Amino acid sequence: QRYLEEADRKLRQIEQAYEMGFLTDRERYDQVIQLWTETTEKVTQAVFKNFEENYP
């Protein structure tokens, strides 16, 4: 939950960038894509660590 909500805030961030002119469409796209990529990485790592720490 925590991480996803963070990634949601960051999503808004990227959106604002795109609206400010600092980003074009495709780099906003790429940034969103890598954000969700590393978010998937995040939750995966969190899953394995949660298994190892709590229920081996």
Swiss-Prot record:
Whole-protein residues included: 961 to 1016 of 1524
Subunit annotation: The RNAP catalytic core consists of 2 alpha, 1 beta, 1 beta' and 1 omega subunit. When a sigma factor is associated with the core the holoenzyme is formed, which can initiate transcription.
The protein's name: DNA-directed RNA polymerase subunit beta'
Disulphide bridges, residue numbers: none
Homology family: Belongs to the RNA polymerase beta' chain family.
Gene name of the record: rpoC
Function: DNA-dependent RNA polymerase catalyzes the transcription of DNA into RNA using the four ribonucleoside triphosphates as substrates.
Organism: Thermus aquaticus
